Structures are given as C-alpha cells and as structure tokens.
Amino acid sequence: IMDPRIVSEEHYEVARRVREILQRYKDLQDIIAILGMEELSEEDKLIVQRARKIQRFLSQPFHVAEHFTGRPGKYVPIEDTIRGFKEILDGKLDDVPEQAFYMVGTIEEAVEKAKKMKK
Amino acid sequence: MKQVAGKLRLDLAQYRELQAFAQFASDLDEATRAQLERGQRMTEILKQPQYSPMPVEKQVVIIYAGTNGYLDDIPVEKVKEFEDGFLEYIESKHPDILEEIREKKALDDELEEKLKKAIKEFKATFK
C-alpha cells in the first residue's frame, strides 16, 4: 500500500522523509563513537537531534501492556499519526527534550509532559 | 548515446570516490567543489519513477544538457522540475528533433540547435 496512487499525498511524503532522516542517522551514529560528536558539521548535528526524537515518538503504551509499562494504554488515529510526525520533521519541537516521547500517545501530550518536567 | 554517455561515465566515476569522504567539509579547492556539484546534479537526472520509460531521443537530450554543465545555476532539488520544464519546451520541437535524432542519430551536427534553444529559452525566462 505504500504507493503514491493509494495513500494521501502528505502520508506518502511524511513516510518517505522519516525513512531518509533515520537512514542518514543510522550511518552517522556509528562514526560518532570513534570521531566524537564535536567533529561533525551543523547539518549532521541537526539530523542527530531530530532523528533521536522521531525514533522515540514511534513508541506507544499498549492496553495489553499495562503490567509491563505501568501506564493505562492509548489509541492514535491515522490523521494524528501523520500530523504528529510532520511537526517533528519540520523542526517545530526542536526545543522539547528527547525524553518526552517514550511511551506517549498524541503529540499534544509531549508538550504537556515537558511542562510537567518544568521545561 | 555513445557520444553523450562518454562524458557521463567520467563525471559519475569521479563522484563515486569523492562523496564518501568530502561530503561534510566546508571549504575545499574549487575543482573538488565543481566535481561534487556536477556529481550531485547528474545523480538527480538518473532518478526515475515507475511505469514512465523514456524514449532514447529524450534521454540523450537531457543527459547532453547535464554533462555539458548548463545546470550549474539550478539547485539540486530543482533538477527534477528542470527535466519536465525542458521537455515541455521540446514538445513544440518534437516534430523537428524526433525526425532528426531518430533518423540521423547525429548529435555532433545537432550541437548548434541544442545549445541555442537550451540557453536562450531558460536564460530569458529565469532572469
């Protein structure tokens, strides 16, 4: 189903942009372990910072996982999945800490959680 | 294709070696900058969508335009928009270039007409 004729235009764009930023980060994180993060350029630093947040926002608390997560469980509809990933790709939430995306649901919760974290 | 693809082989071969190391560096020699910039643009011309094969006459025209370096003022993201825009101007000349490239296959004689149309049409519209 990941064909431009079947899905919406922004669904196709957001899905292809997620794979490119994470594929770029995958090859670059290996280098950082030997050269150190101080030696890489500003475009690389920006890709690392956004890729970390994207990779964590892919996480979600399941209803069947309450015993393993200590959380109640949440459902996210397709429009909210597309809307949430787009703000991260466009850099809107560069200020939010990378620890505000673990086991969360909708993107509004990440901003509320950052306020609870006093930031 | 033999006349045009010769330049493509050299420009693309010098790019495969250079990007693996010189991609991140801010300031290098102008030769290396031009080799990277040409290699980035030629690797955008080779990208293509499904179920849309290109006739050889259209292929040699776009490759000729890129190899000679007329895309040096065109951003790496705009190269795909330039292919469709240039091929639209050529729709008016399909009657002329289809018969000449399909029958004569002589891109050596055709250099004057390709250079004249590509430079005057885009420089007059883009300025």
Partner: protein, 282 residues
Amino acid sequence: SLRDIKTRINATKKTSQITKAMEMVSTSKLNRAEQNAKSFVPYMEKIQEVVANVALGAGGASHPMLVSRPVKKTGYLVITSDRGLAGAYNSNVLRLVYQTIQKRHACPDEYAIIVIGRVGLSFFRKRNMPVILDITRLPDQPSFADIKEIARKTVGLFADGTFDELYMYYNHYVSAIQQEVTERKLLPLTDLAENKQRTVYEFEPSQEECLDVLLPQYAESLIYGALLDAKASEHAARMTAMKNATDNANELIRTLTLSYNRARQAAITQEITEIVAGANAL
C-alpha cells in the same frame, strides 16, 4: 562470529574514509596557514626592527617597560586549539606551563593566567587556578585586528604596573612532522636587538609617550606571530594524527578481512560436512 566481525569491518571502513577527509582538509589548511604566515614575515621584520632600534639606541634605560624591577606578581600567556583531535599538541604546552608555575610559585595569588582555546580554558577550570582572560571561538584565519583588544588588555595591565614579569607559551612550526613547544619572555624588555647601523629619530615627542606607543606595537606583533605559528603547527599536528589514524584503520581492515575469509571457509566446510554426514546416515 562471522556476522559480528563484518559490522566491525563496515565501521572501520566508514571511519577510515572520514579520518582521510580530515587529513585532506587539514593539509589544505596547513598550506594557507604557512602562506599567510610567510606573507606577514616582511611586515613583522620591518615593524620589530624600527621599534627595537629606537628603544635601545642612543639612550639609557629610564622607562618601566625597559628597566629591571623587583617582581611583586607575574603573568603567563598560553595558546591552545578549540577542538581535541589535534593529538599531543595541546597536552605538551599545558605540561610545560603547569610544571613551571608549580616549580617557582606555591599559591594562586602570586601569578595571573591568560589563555586562548577551549581545552586550555577547560584545563584551568578543572582542578583550581585563576584566569584573567579566556578568549575562544577565534576564526581559522586570524587578522592583526582580531586579537588587538586581547593584546591591549595584556600590555595595558603591564604598562599600568599591575604585572612585573610576563611569559608566552606556544608551539613553533618547523616541519610537517616536527613542531616544538616554545617559551619566550615578553616583558620587561631586559634584552633588545642591535643592528650596529643607526639613523636620526624626531626629538619633539616626549620620551615616555613615544615608548608608551611603540611598546604595545611590539607586543601585538609578537602575540600575532605566535598565533600564526600556533595555527600552522595545529594543522600540521592534526594532519599527522589523521594520517596515522587512517593507516591504523586500514591495517585493522585487512586483518579483519583475512579473519572473515577464514570464518567464511570454515563455515562452508563445516556446513557441507554436516550435510554429507546426514545424507550418509540416511
């Protein structure tokens, strides 16, 4: 494991190509640093000789910058690089200045420290030592006007009588493989050059005001000269460090490649023998 060692090869291959990128870019920057330094040498020669000749010729020592004085307190200038992949370049200048301050002074109030570069500043911020100046983020190509205000503070504090003795620590560029940790005494000017050939100078400007103008010009020139050699030696040090890092990675890639080929052949002979043993049994 055959799958595990392959990841190490892929890592070493990419990281070697990146240490090679840092070698080529440092090589280009070393040439500009040496070319730029050689361009200011004629200027440095002209400005230093004219101020030296008027400061020592046809007159006695009667100015606080030239005259010997009892030392109440002293200052030190040490210059270092902003990033850490330069090799032993930063550690050796810090070693010499640290051992020297500890050898003749036992309390932090006795001396003042002037430092250039994030690693030098970090070295004085860790442990416990005082700092009067902490400049960082200077451009790759320094101009005479870039460090003018930093040099003005250092010579100004001396001219105002706050410091009685001043020393400079920096690396000197000799060759693409050899760089020397070097030390100089900037003030007081207890020693000066003598050309043995002299010409007349104007007697209208006051002796004190004339010296007060030419002394800072010499200090600015000397500190700028030290930076030119320090940036050239930094690029030379990083070029050698990246060359060795790339060679170590290329050697590791062939040794790992040979081990992978042994594992590949071992896995195939073991697999084919388990297959044939099973077929023979059946």
